[PDB]
Enzyme design. Sequence first.
Site, short mmCIF file in Angstrom:
data_model
loop_
_atom_site.label_atom_id
_atom_site.label_comp_id
_atom_site.label_asym_id
_atom_site.label_seq_id
_atom_site.Cartn_x
_atom_site.Cartn_y
_atom_site.Cartn_z
N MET A 1 0.82 -15.99 7.76
CA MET A 1 0.25 -17.28 7.40
C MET A 1 1.30 -18.29 6.99
O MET A 1 1.24 -19.45 7.42
CB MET A 1 -0.76 -17.11 6.26
CG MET A 1 -1.92 -16.18 6.60
SD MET A 1 -3.34 -17.06 7.26
CE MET A 1 -3.99 -17.79 5.76
N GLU B 1 -0.40 -11.25 -2.26
CA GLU B 1 -1.58 -11.51 -3.08
C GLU B 1 -1.50 -10.68 -4.35
O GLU B 1 -2.13 -9.62 -4.49
CB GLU B 1 -2.86 -11.22 -2.30
CG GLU B 1 -4.12 -11.70 -3.01
CD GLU B 1 -5.36 -11.58 -2.15
OE1 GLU B 1 -5.33 -10.82 -1.16
OE2 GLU B 1 -6.35 -12.26 -2.47
N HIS C 1 -7.09 -22.40 1.29
CA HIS C 1 -7.23 -21.17 2.05
C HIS C 1 -7.22 -21.48 3.54
O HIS C 1 -8.12 -22.16 4.04
CB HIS C 1 -8.51 -20.44 1.68
CG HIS C 1 -8.70 -19.14 2.40
ND1 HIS C 1 -9.83 -18.85 3.13
CD2 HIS C 1 -7.89 -18.07 2.51
CE1 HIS C 1 -9.71 -17.65 3.66
NE2 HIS C 1 -8.54 -17.15 3.30
N1 LIG Z 1 -2.57 -12.42 6.22
C1 LIG Z 1 -3.69 -13.05 6.52
O1 LIG Z 1 -4.17 -13.06 7.65
C2 LIG Z 1 -4.40 -13.79 5.41
C3 LIG Z 1 -5.59 -14.49 5.61
C4 LIG Z 1 -6.15 -15.19 4.57
C5 LIG Z 1 -5.52 -15.22 3.35
N2 LIG Z 1 -4.37 -14.54 3.13
C6 LIG Z 1 -3.69 -14.60 1.80
O2 LIG Z 1 -2.78 -15.70 1.79
C7 LIG Z 1 -1.43 -15.21 1.75
C8 LIG Z 1 -0.96 -15.02 3.18
O3 LIG Z 1 0.17 -14.11 3.22
P1 LIG Z 1 0.37 -13.27 4.57
O4 LIG Z 1 -0.63 -12.16 4.62
O5 LIG Z 1 0.44 -14.21 5.73
O6 LIG Z 1 1.82 -12.65 4.33
P2 LIG Z 1 2.39 -11.15 4.26
O7 LIG Z 1 1.68 -10.41 3.17
O8 LIG Z 1 2.40 -10.56 5.63
O9 LIG Z 1 3.89 -11.48 3.80
C9 LIG Z 1 4.07 -12.27 2.60
C10 LIG Z 1 5.48 -12.79 2.56
O10 LIG Z 1 5.82 -13.19 1.21
C11 LIG Z 1 7.20 -12.97 1.04
N3 LIG Z 1 7.52 -12.97 -0.38
C12 LIG Z 1 7.38 -11.92 -1.25
N4 LIG Z 1 7.76 -12.20 -2.47
C13 LIG Z 1 8.19 -13.52 -2.40
C14 LIG Z 1 8.72 -14.39 -3.36
N5 LIG Z 1 8.92 -14.06 -4.64
N6 LIG Z 1 9.06 -15.64 -2.96
C15 LIG Z 1 8.86 -15.97 -1.68
N7 LIG Z 1 8.37 -15.23 -0.68
C16 LIG Z 1 8.05 -14.00 -1.11
C17 LIG Z 1 7.41 -11.62 1.72
O11 LIG Z 1 8.77 -11.31 1.95
C18 LIG Z 1 6.59 -11.81 3.00
O12 LIG Z 1 7.38 -12.43 4.01
C19 LIG Z 1 -1.55 -13.92 0.93
O13 LIG Z 1 -1.72 -14.24 -0.45
C20 LIG Z 1 -2.84 -13.35 1.52
O14 LIG Z 1 -3.51 -12.40 0.71
C21 LIG Z 1 -3.84 -13.77 4.14
#
Ligand SMILES: NC(=O)c1ccc[n+]([C@@H]2O[C@H](COP(=O)([O-])OP(=O)(O)OC[C@H]3O[C@@H](n4cnc5c(N)ncnc54)[C@H](O)[C@@H]3O)[C@@H](O)[C@H]2O)c1
Length: 711
Positions: free
Chosen positions: A327, A405, A453
């Site tokens: 995302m 998250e 979101h």
């Molecule tokens: N993944 C989805 O399809 C989806 C859909 C809706 C909502 N969300 C929520 O929104 C967010 C989307 O995250 P995602 O699933 O795309 O990513 P992910 O979980 O695949 O990866 C998250 C990224 O955050 C980075 N990160 C970790 N600690 C960090 C820090 N201190 N500072 C900066 N970067 C840091 C990690 O290295 C990683 O690249 C999450 O909170 C998730 O729960 C996810």
Amino acid sequence: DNTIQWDKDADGIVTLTMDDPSGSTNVMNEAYIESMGKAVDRLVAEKDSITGVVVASAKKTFFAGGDVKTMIQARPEDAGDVFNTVETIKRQLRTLETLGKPVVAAINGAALGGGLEIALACHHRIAADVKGSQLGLPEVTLGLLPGGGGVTRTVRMFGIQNAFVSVLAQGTRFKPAKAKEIGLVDELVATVEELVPAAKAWIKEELKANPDGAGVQPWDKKGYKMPGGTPILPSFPSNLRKQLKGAPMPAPRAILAAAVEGAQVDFDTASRIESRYFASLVTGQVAKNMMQAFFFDLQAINAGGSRPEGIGKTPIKRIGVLGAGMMGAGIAYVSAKAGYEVVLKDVSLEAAAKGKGYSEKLEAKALERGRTTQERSDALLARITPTADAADFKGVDFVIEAVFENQELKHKVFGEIEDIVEPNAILGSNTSTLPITGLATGVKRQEDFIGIHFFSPVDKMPLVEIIKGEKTSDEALARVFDYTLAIGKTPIVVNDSRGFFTSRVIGTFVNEALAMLGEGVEPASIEQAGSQAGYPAPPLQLSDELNLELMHKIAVATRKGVEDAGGTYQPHPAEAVVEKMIELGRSGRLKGAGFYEYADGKRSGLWPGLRETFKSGSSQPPLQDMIDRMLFAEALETQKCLDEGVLTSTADANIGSIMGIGFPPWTGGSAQFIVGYSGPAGTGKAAFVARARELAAAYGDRFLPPESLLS
Ligand SMILES: NC(=O)c1ccc[n+]([C@@H]2O[C@H](COP(=O)([O-])OP(=O)(O)OC[C@H]3O[C@@H](n4cnc5c(N)ncnc54)[C@H](O)[C@@H]3O)[C@@H](O)[C@H]2O)c1
């Protein structure tokens, strides 16, 4: 009041100017029908002194289409009167078409639905090349069909195959350059000043070069052969034949019916077949659901229905994305599509640079398809600047967090950045279920903290669910509302609550299908009922995208959140299926195995050992019961969000359910499904209530309708 002024010069070329006084746009209302009748009746009374007609407009558009305020009130018993109305429309266009004199449309902008149908009744179509001008017949998206001759004429012009696939089936909107190439427009001009002069000049030229065929359409001459030859042949059209079955949406098949049946007869009988199928769809419940959602609700949202009323614009300068992932990296691409500078941060500089590389893989694919230009490709990547230093975030006035998250982590991620970013910077959070008010406690300025979101993949999903916390200022709400319109996406505003709205409602949908599996239903019938109900993704297929282990702790937070209140918790029957699937080591697509087997990142067939696990075959409910169990779950849950105040308008509910969680478009939304439900025992809310109690007495108390639906 009249809508068409009459202008005639000495040469004898009458100019019909469509200038509707009751609004900014010409629309096929009862006033237009009055005017076009008296205007076409005059062209026949003065036939001896008129050598040609010109059809122009006095608005920024040409003609907007049908009167949707009246079409949505059309009851099924009005089918006969509706047939007579559209017949009157086409009779005026057919008389104007056969005056024996040339007729030219001077298209000066947008010409949609009824507007293009008026222009198709002309012999020559000159259109300007103005930015924003669109042409097409988009009434298929509203469950309707081009009933003012659009189906009959397009089939006569391009044949059944071309007219259906290009213009009619999808309701494609064209720019004037693309409209000229396919055959919808015969000539282009530079500006609108030379539209009317080029029409009279083309009439003067045609009156001597083609003096016998002038005013005679190609399909009215003696030896006419329709292109592609005259005529159920759903094998020649493209792989998008799932719409041609006409099972949930009757509009695509009805259009094909009027086209194929109209090609075996002459033009006048083909026209009447077009009218019969038009009164069939218009007086139906499906067309009302689609007219409600994709016309009234969409416009109400893009006009600021959920946006606070007295806030002005705050232009955005630099953006910062905390956490580049599936995302976060996508958030950087959609923001960089506009002129917004984007600063990306992650744990390490390579993890931030890797996130940009994914954004470059989308641009490289667009270059291979020729979507944009190369100078625009380098300019887009020149706005993304990944880094691991917070000093780059200095100057950012719009933060979008997308880290893991984790609650105590997000308090830390902002704690590093809240002092370095601007004092007016938006502290936006992208969380799936964590309450926003519980996340704003970690920043100093709670009034600017807000939930934003997105949906994955970010480049594809058109919805943004804005979640408002208890401390969230209405000005920060408006600044995010404007940012969503800038990335081309649609916004809905939600009050902070467990599960928000989009993840809470989609949970009751996926939990219903998992419940049937634990009850002993064949997994093929669950996916069949899902496909037949109109979901783009069957629920077990959707349950492997959303991680089951991610859905595990969703059921742990709810359980302990009810036990903390000193009450006994009642588990959903789907929870046992999840724990059973977790025991077997099948957690979804990410793990590589779930309800479907997975190989090389693709989806193989359903797991063979799944039937033995849940004793599949012991439960065999009716197919409609399965279809209605999943739909009513989302409709009842949506209703409880409107009672709790999670949503403030049905338009957000309807558009949120469609563009967010894949609710069937023919329902018009999860809120519309309550007032638009139709079964063998009636239509409307009372019928919805009666059917809800029927599912409740058979399957469980979770189907009992709330008090707000009763009286
Ligand atoms: N993944 C989805 O399809 C989806 C859909 C809706 C909502 N969300 C929520 O929104 C967010 C989307 O995250 P995602 O699933 O795309 O990513 P992910 O979980 O695949 O990866 C998250 C990224 O955050 C980075 N990160 C970790 N600690 C960090 C820090 N201190 N500072 C900066 N970067 C840091 C990690 O290295 C990683 O690249 C999450 O909170 C998730 O729960 C996810």
